Symmetry: C3
Subunit: 114 residues, 3 copies
Amino acid sequence: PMFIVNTNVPRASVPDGFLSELTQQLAQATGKPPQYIAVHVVPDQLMAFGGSSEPCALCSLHSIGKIGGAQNRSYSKLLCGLLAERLRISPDRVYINYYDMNAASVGWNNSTFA
Amino acid sequence: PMFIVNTNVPRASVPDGFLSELTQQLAQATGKPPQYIAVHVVPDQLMAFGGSSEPCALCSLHSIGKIGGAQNRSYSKLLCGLLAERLRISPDRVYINYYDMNAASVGWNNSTFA
Amino acid sequence: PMFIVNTNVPRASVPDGFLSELTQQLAQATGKPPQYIAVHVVPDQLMAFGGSSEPCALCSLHSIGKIGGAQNRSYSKLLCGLLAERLRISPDRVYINYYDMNAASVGWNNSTFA
């Protein structure tokens, strides 16, 4: 899975160990070994949520499988809990787009997950 | 909801108020309360459009409702005028990807819209 | 075609000519007019891959056609090749998402393709 977080929160508020924690949490959550998990955090973004520049985040989770109505509902719970606790962002100022990638459409090591 | 602009134009030339203006124009355009609208602007990006480095833009629009062939045509006129006027970007140097999102695949406030 | 590269490699390591290089080679690989291909590179990113912070890349290739099982496979060799050769990233620490874009859902110059 690939998890990306874009936020207007300044880099300095991102705690030491945040990428480590997202990896471990997401691995336990999707059931995938952590080795396949990529994490990208982008701090200091311009962005606005209701024409308001209060702390917010726009995230996305891509995965070959493990995406679904029930599943995504659990992930919002997990992910929004972390941004709240770790970065102090209100959950209702957080959007997370979920993507169910087809294996043939993910290139990895000079080829794709055929 | 969810509008992103990646551009090589300098940060110093993105007008203050650009985010609010986008917020308002999109609210009108999509008939979605401005409150549901999130906007992200990324200036100073490396990027190139047709081999060339003159100002260019790569945007994407994600909305649960309101996406579709004819509508997208209007979104393009609206978005191209805005970038051309506010950022001095030429309309032929702009791509905008449109994404109709299923409510189950969008998380907000500890849950998803399904 | 639009190609984005997100990597933790320092900006100072992106060789001059990299964007032209990618433009040239993608045009050839996809056989599409180079004047139509945008390239976006983003260095110095907070990324983790398999829990590690060693060099890695999260890329994307959006294209109206020219995308499918086999081609994605060759795009990967070519792309992972370039990245390894210029940015010294190991191909097994590179993910590339392929998005077969639907014309009508891509905006450019005040309208949409098809």
